Design a protein around this ligand. Structure first.
Ligand SMILES: CCCCCCCCCCCCCCCCCC(=O)OC[C@H](COP(=O)([O-])OCC(O)COP(=O)([O-])OC[C@@H](COC(=O)CCCCCCCCCCCCCCCCC)OC(=O)CCCCCCCCCCCCCCCCC)OC(=O)CCCCCCCCCCCCCCCCC
Ligand SMILES: CCCCCCCCCCCCCCCCCC(=O)OC[C@H](COP(=O)([O-])OCC(O)COP(=O)([O-])OC[C@@H](COC(=O)CCCCCCCCCCCCCCCCC)OC(=O)CCCCCCCCCCCCCCCCC)OC(=O)CCCCCCCCCCCCCCCCC
Ligand SMILES: CCCCCCCCCCCCCCCCC[C@@H](O)O[C@H](CO[C@H](O)CCCCCCCCCCCCCCC)COP(=O)(O)OCC[N+](C)(C)C
Ligand SMILES: CCCCCCCCCCCCCCCCC[C@@H](O)O[C@H](CO[C@H](O)CCCCCCCCCCCCCCC)COP(=O)(O)OCC[N+](C)(C)C
Ligand SMILES: CCCCCCCCCCCC(=O)SCCNC(=O)CCNC(=O)[C@H](O)C(C)(C)COP(=O)(O)O
Lengths: 459, 104, 88, 178, 56, 68
C-alpha cells in the first residue's frame, strides 16, 4: 500500500521546496489527489482483508478511517491558512510538516499488521499533535493542555506496552492474523484481570472514557483549528480501532470485565449531555458532545455483537465528519469576533444566511436525523443494547432527548434572536469557508446514499 | 518608567475585502487567491467528489452478494425439489466429530 | 394592500377627533397646543384616561414613563409619529 | 422606552400606574363597551374618594390594600396589544431589522445600483465624522465631576451642533424594515 | 523560456513520481509472496497451453 | 412609494453557490451523459454457463460494463 504512503513522504519535500507563496496551493492539490488515490481501498472482500505485505494490510474497518484521514488533511490545510497569514515562511512550512507527519503516522497506524508496530505509530502520533498544540495555540492554557494531553495518554499506554511484550513471550507472535486464528480463552485469575486492564486502559483513555476524559476539553479548546479537527475526527477513533482489534484475545473475561466501563459509559454519556446544556464556551460544548458520542461507541464495542460493531463503525465515521464541521463553524465566528463565548455574537442568521444554513445542517446531523449515518450508527447501537438488556432503552432514550436540546440550543443561541448591537466587524462569508462547509457536509449525505461502505467488517 | 518591558502594540486585524472587494478569502495576492480558489473547487468538487462517488457507486461486487443470492437460490431449489429440510441445525457433519468416550 | 401610510395630518386629525368627544373639554376652547393641566384644568386621572383613549384609538400601548410626559395634543401626535416612523 | 428612568417612583406615579392597570384589567373582565364604561366610572369614583388625604402614611396603606385587591382580582388572561411585550406580534419583525453598517460591506456591483442613496449615505457619514469631536467635548463639559447621576443626555446648544450620541438613535432600522 | 517555468513548478512531479514508485514497490513486495501461487486447494488449476503463471 | 431595504451583502453567497453548481455540473454532466450512452448502447452482460474447458477472466464475473 506504499502507493499511498510514499506520496505523503513526497508531500514533505514538495512543501519544503515550494516557492514562498505557493505552499498552500501545492499542498491542497496533492492532498486531494492522495485522497482520490486512497478512495480505491473501499473495494473490500467479504471473507478476509487485503494483505498487501508482511507489514501492512487493509480491512473493511480501517479503509473508511484511512479515507477520512486523507480527506481531512486538505480540509485542515484550507482551515489553517487564514490565521497563519502573518507567520513566516519557515514556520508555515513547519506547520505543514507537522500536519503531513501526523497524516503519515495515522496512515501507518491504521494498516499495521503488528501490534508493537501499531503501538509505536499510535504513540508517535503524540509528538506532532503536542508540538502543534503547545506552539501554535493562542492562549497561555495551551502549555498545561499539552501536559494534560501527554501524560494522560502515556500513563495509559506504557502498561499496554508491557502487556504487549508479555503476550509475545507467551504466544510467540503479535501479528494480528495469527493472533486471531490462534486465539484461546482467557481464564479467570488476577493475572488475567490485570492483563485485561493493561490491554484495555490505553484505548479507553484515548476514547476518552468518562472519568478519564479531563484532558479532552483542554486539548480541544486550546488547540488551533486544524489541531481540534484532527484531535476530534481521527485521533479519538484510535481508541475505538484499537479496542475492536485487541478484544479478540480478551474473551471471555470481557463478559464480566465490561460492567464498570459500561456503567461509566452510560451514566457519563448522560452526564456529559447534561453538561452541554450549561456551557458558556462554544468549543467546550462540541468537545463534550464528542465525549457523549464516544461513550456510545464504547458501549457498542464493549457489548461485543455484530450489530454493535456495525453501529460503532458508522458512528465513528459520522462523528468525525460532524465534529470537524462543528469546530470549523465555531472557528469562523471566533476569527470574526476573537472570543469563544456563545452568547457574545447572537442573531447571526440575519447577517450570514448561508452560514446559518450550514449551522442548521450541522446541528440536524448532530442530533441524528434520519436517514443520516449518525442515526444509522446510533440506532444499530441502541438495538444491540436493547438485546443486551431491555432497561438500557431508558438511558439511551434519555440521551436522545438531551442531545437534541443542547444541539438546537447552540443553534438558537448563535443564529436566532437579535444581533448584538456593538459588534460591527462581521464581514460577509468568504468563498473558502463556504467551500469548507460544503466539502464537510456533502460526503455525509453521499455516504448516507451508500451506507454499507462505513458499516465495517461485520456487514 | 512605570512600564515592565519594551513591546510592540497589538495590531488591528486586516480585512481582506478592503484591498480586494472580491477576495475569496484565500490570500492577499489576488492572482494567487483566485488560483487557490480555482484549484480547490476543481480538485475538491469536480475531481474527488463527483468522480469518486461515481467510482464507488460502480465498484465491482467483491463482497459476493449476488453470488451468495444465486447460491442460495440453487440450494433452495434443490432442497425443496428433493424434500430435504431447507437448513440443518448442524453446520458440520457429526461423522467427523469425535466426542469424548465417557461422560460420567 | 395593508393599512395606508399614516401621515402627520391624519394623526393630528384623529387625536383632535378623540379629544373633542371628551365631555370634560370644550371643543371650541381646545387647540393643538393646549395644556391639559394649565389650559384645560384636568388632573392626572383625566390625563391617564386620555392616554388610554389614544391607545384604544391607535391600537398600540404607550409606556407609563413615556405617557406621563405627554401634556398637549401636539406632544401626543409627535410621540405617535416617532413611534410609527412617520415623516410626512 | 424613550425617557430616562428616575431613581424611584413617586407616590402619585404609583397610584396612577395602579389606576391604569386596574382599568385595563377591568376592561378585560367587562368585554362589552357600555358595561365597561359603567364599571370604569365606578372605579374612577372609588379612586377619587380618597384623593384628598393629607396623611401620607394612611395614603400608602390604602395603596397597599389597593395592590392586594388588584392582585387577588386581576384577570388571569388580560388583553395585550399585539405589539406589546406580551402580545402575539411583540418581536415579529426583529428578524428583518438589519444594521446600517452592513451596507459598508456590499460589493461594488451591488453599490452600482442605488447610486444616489449611497451618495446620501456618504454625506451622512461625513456629518457624523465632523460632529463627533464636538459631541465628546460637550459631554465632557456638561458632566458633573463625580460622574453622571442619570441617563439623560443634553441637547445641542451651539450654532451648528448636533445632540451628543445621536447616530444610533437617528439611524434606527425601522418598525417594519422589510 | 521554459527554464523559469521548470524551476518554479518542478515540485509538481514529486507526488506523482512517488505514486508510481509506490506502485512499483508494491509489485516488488508482491513478487516475494508467491510460495503458494496456484497451490491453494480452492484455486489450484491446470495451466493454459501458453500462460506461465496464474497471477503476477 | 418605494423605500430602500437594508440587507447584508448577498453577492458572495450567490457567487459561491454559482461556482459550486458550475464545477459540480462541469464534471457531472459528462459523467451522466456517458453513463446514459453506455447503458443504452452497451447493455449489461447476460448470465450464462461456463463452457467446458474455458477459464474466464476475473472481470468477466461481473455484469455491469462500468464495473467490469
Ligand atoms: C425528499 C425531498 C426530495 C428533494 C429532491 C431534491 C433534493 C436536493 C438535495 C440537495 C443536496 C442537499 C444540499 C444540502 C445543503 C444545502 C445547499 C444549499 O445551500 O442550498 C441553497 C439553495 C439556494 O438557497 P438560498 O437562497 O441560498 O438560501 C440560503 C438561506 O440560508 C435560506 O436557506 P433555506 O431556509 O432554504 O434552508 C435550506 C433548506 C434545505 O437545506 C437543507 O436542509 C439541506 C440538508 C437537508 C438535511 C440533511 C440532514 C438530514 C439527513 C438527510 C439525508 C438525505 C441524503 C440523501 C442524499 C443526498 C445527497 C446529497 O432548509 C430546509 O428546507 C429544511 C432542512 C431540513 C429538511 C428535513 C428533511 C427531513 C428528511 C426528508 C427526507 C430525506 C430522505 C429522502 C428519502 C426518504 C425516503 C424516500 O437552495 C437550494 O438549493 C435548495 C435547498 C435544498 C433543500 C433540500 C431539502 C430536501 C432534500 C433532502 C435531501 C436530498 C434528497 C434527494 C433524493 C430524494 C430523497
Ligand atoms: C447542482 C448540484 C448542487 C449540489 C447538490 C449536491 C450534489 C452532489 C453530487 C455528488 C456526485 C454524485 C455522484 C453519484 C453517482 C450515482 C450514479 C448512479 O449510480 O446511477 C444510478 C442510476 C443508473 O442506474 P444503472 O445501474 O447505471 O443502469 C442499469 C441498467 O442497465 C440501465 O437500464 P436501461 O437499459 O433501461 O437504460 C436506462 C438509460 C436510458 O433509458 C432510457 O432512455 C429510457 C427512459 C424512459 C423514457 C421512456 C419514455 C419517454 C420517451 C417516450 C417518447 C419518445 C419515444 C417515441 C418517439 C415519438 C414520440 C411519442 O438511462 C440511464 O442510464 C439512467 C440515467 C443515468 C444517470 C446517472 C447519474 C450520474 C450522476 C453523476 C453526476 C452528479 C451531478 C449531477 C449532474 C447530472 C445531470 C444534472 O441512475 C439513477 O439515478 C436512476 C434513477 C431513475 C429511476 C426512476 C426514479 C424512481 C422514483 C421512485 C421513488 C419515488 C419516491 C419519491 C422520491 C423521488 C426522487 C426521484
Ligand atoms: C476515574 C475512572 C477511571 C477508570 C475506572 C476503571 C475501572 C477498574 C475496575 C476493575 C473491575 C473489576 C476488578 C476485579 C474484578 C472483580 C472485583 C471484585 O470486587 O470481585 C470479587 C473479588 O473479591 C473481593 O472483592 C477481593 C478484591 C478486594 C480488593 C480489591 C480492591 C478494591 C478497592 C476499590 C478501589 C478503586 C479502584 C480504582 C482506583 C482508581 C470477585 O470475587 P473473587 O472470586 O474472589 O475474585 C475473582 C478472581 N478470582 C477468580 C481469581 C478469584
Ligand atoms: C444547491 C441546491 C441542491 C438541490 C438541487 C439538487 C438537484 C438534484 C441532485 C440531488 C440527487 C438526489 C439523490 C437521488 C438518488 C440517486 C443516486 C443513487 O441512485 O446512486 C446511488 C449510488 O451512490 C453512491 O454509491 C454513493 C457515493 C459514494 C460516496 C463517497 C464520497 C466521495 C469521497 C470523498 C471523501 C470521503 C470522506 C468520508 C470517509 C468515508 C445508488 O446506489 P446503488 O444501490 O449501489 O446503485 C445500484 C446500481 N449500480 C451499483 C450499478 C450503480
Ligand atoms: C379589577 C380588579 C382590581 C380592582 C383594583 C382597584 C380598586 C382600588 C381602588 C381604591 C384605591 C384608592 O383609591 S387609593 C387612594 C390613595 N390616596 C391618595 O392618593 C391621596 C393623595 N392624593 C394624590 O396622591 C393625588 O391627588 C392622586 C390621587 C394620585 C391624583 O393625582 P393627580 O390629581 O395629580 O393626577
Amino acid at each position: 500500500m506504499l502507493k499511498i504512503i510514499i506520496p505523503t513522504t513526497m508531500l514533505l519535500p514538495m512543501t519544503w521546496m515550494s516557492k514562498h507563496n505557493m505552499i498552500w496551493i501545492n499542498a491542497t492539490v496533492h492532498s486531494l489527489l492522495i485522497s482520490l488515490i486512497s478512495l480505491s481501498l473501499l473495494n473490500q472482500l467479504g471473507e478476509n482483508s487485503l494483505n498487501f505485505s508482511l507489514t501492512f494490510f487493509s480491512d473493511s474497518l480501517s479503509a473508511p478511517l484511512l479515507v477520512l484521514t486523507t480527506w481531512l488533511l486538505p480540509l485542515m490545510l484550507m482551515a489553517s491558512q487564514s490565521h497563519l497569514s502573518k507567520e513566516t515562511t519557515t514556520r508555515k512550512k513547519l506547520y505543514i510538516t507537522m500536519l503531513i507527519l501526523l497524516q503519515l503516522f495515522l496512515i501507518m497506524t491504521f494498516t499495521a499488521t503488528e501490534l508493537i508496530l501499531f503501538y509505536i505509530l499510535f504513540e508517535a502520533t503524540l509528538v506532532p499533535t503536542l508540538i502543534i498544540i503547545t506552539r501554535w495555540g493562542n492562549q497561555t492554557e495551551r502549555l498545561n493542555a499539552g501536559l494534560y494531553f501527554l501524560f494522560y495518554t502515556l500513563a495509559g499506554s506504557l502498561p499496554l506496552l508491557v502487556a504487549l511484550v508479555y503476550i509475545q513471550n507467551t504466544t510467540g507472535s503479535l501479528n494480528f492474523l495469527i493472533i486471531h486464528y490462534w486465539s484461546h480463552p482467557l481464564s479467570n485469575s488476577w493475572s488475567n484481570i490485570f492483563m485485561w486492564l493493561a490491554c484495555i486502559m490505553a484505548f479507553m483513555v484515548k476514547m476518552p472514557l468518562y472519568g478519564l476524559h479531563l484532558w479532552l476539553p483542554k486539548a480541544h479548546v486550546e488547540a488551533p483549528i486544524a489541531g481540534s479537527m484532527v484531535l476530534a475526527a481521527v485521533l479519538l477513533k484510535l481508541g475505538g480501532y484499537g479496542m475492536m482489534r485487541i478484544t479478540t484475545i480478551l474473551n471471555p473475561l470481557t463478559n464480566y470485565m465490561a460492567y464498570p466501563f459500561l456503567m461509566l459509559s452510560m451514566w457519563g454519556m448522560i452526564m456529559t449531555s447534561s453538561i452541554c446544556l450549561r456551557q458558556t464556551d462554544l468549543k467546550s460544548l462540541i468537545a463534550y458532545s464528542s465525549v457523549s458520542h464516544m461513550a456510545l461507541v464504547i458501549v457498542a464495542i464493549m457489548i461485543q455483537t455484530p450489530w454493535s460493531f456495525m453501529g460503532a463503525t458508522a458512528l465513528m465515521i459520522a462523528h468525525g465528519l460532524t465534529s470537524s464541521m462543528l469546530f470549523c463553524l465555531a472557528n469562523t465566528n471566533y476569527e470574526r469576533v476573537h472570543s469563544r463565548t456563545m452568547i457574545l455574537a447572537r442573531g447571526l442568521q440575519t447577517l450570514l444566511p448561508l452560514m446559518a444554513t450550514w449551522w442548521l445542517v450541522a446541528s440536524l446531523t448532530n442530533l441524528a436525523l434520519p436517514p443520516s449515518i449518525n442515526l444509522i450508527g446510533e440506532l444499530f447501537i441502541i438495538t444491540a443494547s436493547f438485546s443486551w438488556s431491555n432497561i438500557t432503552i431508558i438511558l439511551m432514550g434519555m440521551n436522545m432527548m438531551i442531545t437534541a436540546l443542547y444541539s438546537l440550543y447552540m443553534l438558537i443561541t448563535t443564529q436566532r434572536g437579535k444581533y448584538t448591537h456593538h459588534i460591527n466587524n462581521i464581514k460577509p462569508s468568504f468563498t473558502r469557508e463556504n467551500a469548507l462547509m460544503a466539502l464537510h457536509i456533502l460526503p455525509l449525505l453521499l455516504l448516507t446514499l451508500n451506507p454499507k461502505m462505513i458499516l465495517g467488517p461485520l456487514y | 518608567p512605570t512600564i515592565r518591558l519594551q513591546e510592540d502594540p497589538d495590531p488591528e486585524d486586516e480585512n481582506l475585502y478592503e484591498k480586494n472587494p472580491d477576495s475569496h478569502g484565500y490570500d492577499k495576492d489576488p492572482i494567487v487567491d483566485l488560483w487557490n480558489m480555482r484549484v480547490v473547487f476543481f480538485f475538491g468538487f469536480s475531481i474527488v467528489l463527483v468522480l469518486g462517488s461515481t467510482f464507488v457507486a460502480y465498484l465491482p461486487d467483491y463482497r459476493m452478494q449476488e453470488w451468495a443470492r444465486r447460491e442460495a437460490e440453487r440450494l433452495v431449489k434443490y432442497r425443496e425439489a428433493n424434500g430435504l429440510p431447507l437448513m440443518e441445525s448442524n453446520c458440520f457433519d457429526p461423522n467427523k466429530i469425535q466426542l469424548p468416550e465417557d461422560e460420567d | 394592500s395593508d393599512a395606508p401610510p399614516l401621515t402627520l395630518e391624519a394623526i393630528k386629525d384623529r387625536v383632535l377627533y378623540v379629544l373633542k368627544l371628551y365631555d370634560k373639554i370644550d371643543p371650541e376652547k381646545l387647540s393643538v397646543n393646549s395644556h391639559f393641566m394649565k389650559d384645560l384644568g384636568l388632573d392626572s386621572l383625566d390625563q391617564v384616561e386620555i392616554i388610554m383613549a389614544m391607545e384604544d384609538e391607535f391600537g398600540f400601548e404607550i409606556p407609563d414613563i413615556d405617557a406621563e410626559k405627554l401634556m398637549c395634543p401636539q406632544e401626543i401626535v409627535d410621540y405617535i409619529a416617532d413611534k410609527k416612523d412617520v415623516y410626512e | 422606552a424613550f425617557s430616562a428612568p428616575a431613581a424611584y417612583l413617586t407616590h402619585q406615579q404609583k397610584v396612577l400606574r395602579l389606576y391604569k392597570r386596574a382599568l385595563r384589567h377591568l376592561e378585560s373582565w367587562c368585554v362589552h363597551r357600555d358595561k365597561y364604561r359603567y364599571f370604569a366610572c365606578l372605579m374612577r369614583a372609588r379612586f377619587d374618594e380618597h384623593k384628598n388625604e393629607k396623611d401620607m402614611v394612611k395614603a400608602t396603606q390604602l395603596l397597599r390594600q389597593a395592590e392586594e385587591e388588584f392582585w387577588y382580582g386581576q384577570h388571569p388572561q388580560p388583553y395585550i396589544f399585539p405589539e406589546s411585550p406580551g402580545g402575539t406580534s411583540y418581536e415579529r419583525y426583529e428578524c428583518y431589522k438589519v444594521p446600517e453598517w452592513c451596507l459598508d460591506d456590499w460589493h461594488p456591483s451591488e453599490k452600482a445600483m442605488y447610486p444616489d442613496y449611497f451618495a446620501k449615505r456618504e454625506q451622512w457619514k461625513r456629518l457624523r465624522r465632523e460632529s463627533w469631536e464636538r459631541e465628546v467635548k460637550q459631554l465632557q463639559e456638561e458632566t458633573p465631576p463625580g460622574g453622571p447621576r442619570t441617563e439623560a443626555l443634553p441637547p445641542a446648544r451651539k450654532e451648528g451642533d448636533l445632540p451628543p450620541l445621536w447616530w444610533h438613535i437617528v439611524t434606527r432600522p425601522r418598525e417594519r424594515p422589510m | 523560456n521554459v527554464l523559469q517555468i521548470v524551476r518554479d513548478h518542478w515540485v509538481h512531479i514529486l507526488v506523482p513520481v512517488g505514486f508510481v514508485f509506490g506502485c512499483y514497490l508494491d509489485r516488488r513486495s508482491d513478487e516475494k509472496l508467491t510460495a503458494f501461487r496456484n497451490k491453494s486447494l480452492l484455486f489450484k488449476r491446470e495451466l493454459r497451453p501458453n500462460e506461465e503463471v496464474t497471477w503476477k | 412609494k418605494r423605500l430602500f431595504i437594508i440587507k447584508p451583502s448577498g453577492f458572495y453567497d450567490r457567487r459561491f453557490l454559482k461556482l459550486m453548481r458550475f464545477y459540480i455540473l462541469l464534471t457531472g454532466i459528462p459523467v451522466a451523459i456517458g453513463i446514459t450512452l453506455v447503458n443504452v448502447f452497451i447493455g449489461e452482460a447476460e448470465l450464462a454457463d461456463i463452457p467446458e474447458g474455458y477459464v474466464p477472466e476475473h472481470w468477466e464475473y461481473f455484469k455491469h460494463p462500468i464495473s467490469r
